[PDB]
Write an enzyme that holds these catalytic residues in place. Structure first.
Site, short mmCIF file in Angstrom:
data_model
loop_
_atom_site.label_atom_id
_atom_site.label_comp_id
_atom_site.label_asym_id
_atom_site.label_seq_id
_atom_site.Cartn_x
_atom_site.Cartn_y
_atom_site.Cartn_z
N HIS D 82 -6.46 1.58 -4.39
CA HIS D 82 -5.69 0.34 -4.35
C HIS D 82 -6.40 -0.67 -3.47
CE1 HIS D 82 -4.00 2.30 -0.70
NE2 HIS D 82 -3.70 1.08 -0.29
N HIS D 84 -6.04 -2.59 -0.83
CA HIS D 84 -5.79 -2.96 0.55
C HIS D 84 -7.07 -2.94 1.36
CE1 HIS D 84 -1.21 -1.90 0.66
NE2 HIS D 84 -1.42 -3.17 0.34
N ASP D 86 -8.19 -1.51 3.93
CA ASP D 86 -8.78 -0.29 4.46
C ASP D 86 -9.29 0.62 3.36
OD1 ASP D 86 -5.95 0.02 3.83
OD2 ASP D 86 -5.90 1.82 5.09
N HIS D 87 -9.27 0.17 2.10
CA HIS D 87 -9.87 0.94 1.02
C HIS D 87 -10.83 0.12 0.19
CE1 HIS D 87 -7.04 3.91 2.30
NE2 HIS D 87 -6.11 2.99 2.24
N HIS D 158 2.88 1.99 -3.99
CA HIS D 158 2.26 1.56 -2.74
C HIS D 158 1.66 0.16 -2.88
CE1 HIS D 158 0.30 2.05 1.17
NE2 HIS D 158 -0.78 1.53 0.60
N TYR D 189 8.05 -1.07 4.14
CA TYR D 189 8.45 -1.80 2.96
C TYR D 189 9.96 -1.91 2.87
CZ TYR D 189 3.77 -0.99 0.86
OH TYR D 189 2.42 -0.95 0.58
N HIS D 223 -6.32 8.25 2.43
CA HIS D 223 -6.20 8.73 3.80
C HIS D 223 -6.23 10.25 3.75
CE1 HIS D 223 -5.33 4.82 5.65
NE2 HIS D 223 -4.71 4.56 4.52
C1 QST Z 1 1.74 -0.87 8.50
C2 QST Z 1 0.35 -1.21 7.94
O1 QST Z 1 -0.10 -0.25 7.00
C3 QST Z 1 -1.38 -0.20 6.54
O2 QST Z 1 -2.19 -1.04 6.89
C4 QST Z 1 -1.76 1.00 5.63
C5 QST Z 1 -2.73 0.48 4.55
S1 QST Z 1 -2.82 1.80 3.24
N1 QST Z 1 -0.62 1.77 5.14
C6 QST Z 1 -0.11 2.77 6.05
C7 QST Z 1 0.71 3.92 5.36
O3 QST Z 1 0.39 4.00 4.16
O4 QST Z 1 1.55 4.57 6.01
C8 QST Z 1 -1.22 3.48 6.84
C9 QST Z 1 -0.92 3.62 8.31
C10 QST Z 1 -1.61 4.81 6.23
S2 QST Z 1 -2.62 2.27 6.64
ZN ZN Z 2 -2.50 0.68 1.29
ZN ZN Z 3 -4.71 2.71 3.71
#
Ligand code: QST
Ligand code: ZN
Ligand code: ZN
Ligand code: QST
Ligand code: QST
Ligand code: QST
Ligand code: ZN
Ligand code: ZN
Ligand code: ZN
Ligand code: ZN
Ligand code: ZN
Ligand code: ZN
Lengths: 265, 265, 265, 265
Positions: D82, D84, D86-87, D158, D189, D223
């Site tokens: 996806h 975002h 961090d990916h 997600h 969310y 992750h």
């Molecule tokens: C609150 C901000 O969230 C994020 O920037 C991500 C991006 S995937 N999403 C989170 C989740 O999926 O719980 C995470 C900590 C694994 S990183």
């Molecule tokens: Zn994400």
């Molecule tokens: Zn992530």
């Protein structure tokens, strides 16, 4: 009375007449049609295509690449003279079917991205499949592919993004400075006081000067007739080719005549 | 050792210090922060915004528009000096929240569309939310909103797409020719032999000449200090403002010093 | 033998036959051609257009808007059934000529952005000027314009981004739930085992169910004949209109026949 | 009081801790950081990258590719779980520096193209350099690179464009069906009645079912901790990995708890 049907961009048959690859120099081939240039530059690190012609030419280009030993993955780069439908037409499809990425200046990239629509002079009359540029080039910037160095020379006028591309190849053991200079025509354009292109005339005059001064042992142009190439003439295809100086002078003389006709018209 | 964390684009507090609207002429207001210009031009047929400042300024801009009687639907047009994060930052969000469309030249549009990433000099260090231009403008092109005529004057250098915008407002019954001239600085730029901008020096020199010659009863600049504005000084905010000629001369003198320092560095 | 000339997308004359505005409900008008729907919804806070028809219809749409009291600045929003050339054709030009912004789902936005090129089934045979969406909508998302609430109902199949739009208008003092349901046809499509659309059949079946269940006092469709509208029949234009249930049932029966013919073909 | 400074997207150090390539199967390697997955699949016809991690990881990815024998020209394809930061963070830069083209579904392509801005849940808080997709994929579509067949399985939730990618590799002479399943988390969310994602809950429930049924001898996740991988544990990095069934069950149980907490909150 219904609104008129859409009209397709139709061209002289010779523009659509396939030809076999025609060697220009050791690494540089004409692989388009009889009357539309599409140049393949083949290197030990992949191939470059400069222009593709009309949209329906993609498969023919690919056939000629294959004839030359270039597979789709080997095509690394597409460069453009300008982003009208008869030079950039197949770019989108070539990107889908090859490894090729497009490098262009900002003006050409934005016109390419709208498939030639909202043209400053043609409106939506001459469109094609839109494509994205992968790299934006600045005036005088170089791109190197397997040691062929391509230099961009902006020559705005025919389109805002019109570009000449130059590079040095070899022939019979000696360097050949090739200049692929863009169109300098202004077909049906309003030249004076054009609200969509207020500095049009100044840009053309600067572009004549740019073309005149290019490094130019061999001039090629997107429409071969503009530089007096005859791709169907085989061993003498380039015999009558103009110099860059002669090409620029002829275009300026025609332009000056058009200005006078526009004032009288 | 982990890779470094991302670094945010942080700025002096005054750049982020909200101010109430400051009238420049009958229809033209500064509505940004103390140290970043964002100009609102209000007309009987809607409003124009020239620059927005930093990304986090969107809501403040909208508050000041409201204070002026401009609702989100009334904002028709956003124009830009150049597409760096501290002048174009909130454009994407303003487009989502207002009726506004963006007009920009091709270079600014392509930099805006990548959110300032892959900057010729800053790389990815100074980015912001990307936005699309709705209209591409050419040098010298005019846009008219409720009878205020805005003219584009390209002044490439600080970015390839740097633009001065000029228009005529009124004050005390007489015309005021306002010139919103872009930055002429080159902060940390490699000026000579820059492969990403080979004609950088020539473009700056041409841009100094363009700025010197603008119609210019009142000069404003994206960083007010560059034209000696003090937005926090109220009735005397513009008292010390430079002429366009003085602004261009100062920028050229600084540029020449930077060239000499680069040669020595 | 030259390569073939480009072929324009030509259509039956009735698709291009202008008509005067035809009122559907208190705020909702058909303003397209006899055989292509383009719906104008007029509100105290601006107007919404749902579809525009073929590319050459822009000026006619604008004439009919004017007839209705809608100036270019009053058009706030364009919504689409799907991004084929005969429904989205004039979107790019309308955006240039009005204040309108486009809201669409991601699939429709990406097809709109490439001007209908690289269509999953049509290839590059049916293209139009590309346009950008200003807002991406999710399934079931609402957009409100001067208190008319428009709800998106994805009904993928005819295109991946096919959407039904619903809203409640009034007529003779009572609510009228209008459903603008997209095409459910599959013209020349490979339905089974299509590598470009592997879940095509499942998506159509889900879309039949979506259409059957829409809130639907009045069904309209992009091709009026599909819902048994006759825009040229004046006071009885909508008399024979199908229900959403009948429309979905007919489309599913046709689809099932096409599946059987494809298996036999 | 000035407006707040921009805040950078900062992450746990382990997310940014480079690691050497870790072999998963004969052609598949983890080449990212300790706590962010980036999978390299190496074939006789070039390489595929699935995810890249954070923006600042580009050069490290390129170093690990080189360690594996993959030069920039050999990287043919980037696929994403996806879009975002961090990916997908380094995608734009990898495209500039390699031959790689991006294939993604429409939702991921539109989020990628705005650099993660205007996120349905994060707003502009977590952005990155925008990039364009070169190919749009549909659910269940396959892409083949040197005979590794990658299948897309949409698993919206997600992000709208969340995708699982599956392929069959080999190990100790036998087939290994690898499933790279996307995140099933919903961090902060709003799940119920979200106007920007009205069918969020239904999409997550369908995605749990999709993940449960994937072909899945080996599960990997963006992750690694989500599937109980420990990339720093060497020969036992994958020993504790969950099945796809267990991963889906755990995510659904967490999701159900979050729904109950949201109702109570
Ligand atoms: C609150 C901000 O969230 C994020 O920037 C991500 C991006 S995937 N999403 C989170 C989740 O999926 O719980 C995470 C900590 C694994 S990183
Ligand atoms: Zn994400
Ligand atoms: Zn992530
Ligand atoms: C009038 C339409 O024009 C065109 O479509 C082109 C595109 S380059 N321009 C012409 C020109 O340059 O004279 C041409 C005949 C060489 S083809
Ligand atoms: C070194 C980073 O630079 C910038 O982010 C800007 C953006 S315009 N440029 C500078 C300049 O122009 O001197 C400035 C300090 C006025 S802000
Ligand atoms: C075969 C080409 O098809 C089309 O161009 C359209 C576009 S919607 N689709 C057809 C259909 O839906 O049957 C149609 C005849 C109504 S027009
Ligand atoms: Zn041309
Ligand atoms: Zn031409
Ligand atoms: Zn700047
Ligand atoms: Zn600045
Ligand atoms: Zn259609
Ligand atoms: Zn149709």
């Amino acid at each position: 009375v219904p609104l008129p049907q859409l009209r397709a961009y139709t061209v002289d048959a010779s523009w659509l007449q396939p030809m076999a690859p025609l060697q220009i120099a050791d690494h540089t081939w004409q692989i388009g049609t009889e009357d539309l240039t599409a140049l393949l530059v083949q290197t030990p690190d992949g191939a470059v295509l400069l222009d593709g012609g009309m949209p329906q030419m993609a498969s023919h280009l690919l056939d000629n690449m294959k004839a030359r030993g270039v597979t789709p993955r080997d095509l690394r780069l597409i460069l453009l003279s300008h982003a009208h439908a008869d030079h950039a037409g197949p770019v989108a499809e070539l990107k889908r079917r090859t490894g090729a990425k497009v490098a262009a200046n900002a003006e050409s990239a934005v016109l390419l991205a709208r498939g030639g629509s909202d043209d400053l002079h043609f409106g939506d009359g001459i469109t094609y499949p839109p494509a994205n540029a992968d790299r934006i080039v600045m005036d005088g910037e170089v791109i190197t592919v397997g040691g062929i160095v391509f230099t961009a020379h902006f020559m705005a006028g025919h389109t805002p993004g019109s570009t000449a591309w130059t590079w040095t190849d070899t022939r019979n053991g000696k360097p050949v400075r090739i200049a692929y200079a863009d169109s300098l025509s202004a077909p049906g354009y309003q030249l004076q006081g054009n609200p969509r292109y207020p500095h049009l005339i100044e840009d053309y005059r600067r572009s004549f000067a740019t073309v005149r001064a290019l490094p130019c042992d061999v001039l090629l142009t997107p429409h071969p007739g503009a530089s007096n190439w005859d791709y169907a003439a085989g061993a003498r295809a380039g015999a009558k080719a103009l110099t860059c100086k002669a090409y620029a002078d002829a275009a300026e003389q025609k332009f000056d005549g058009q200005l006078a006709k526009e004032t009288a018209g």
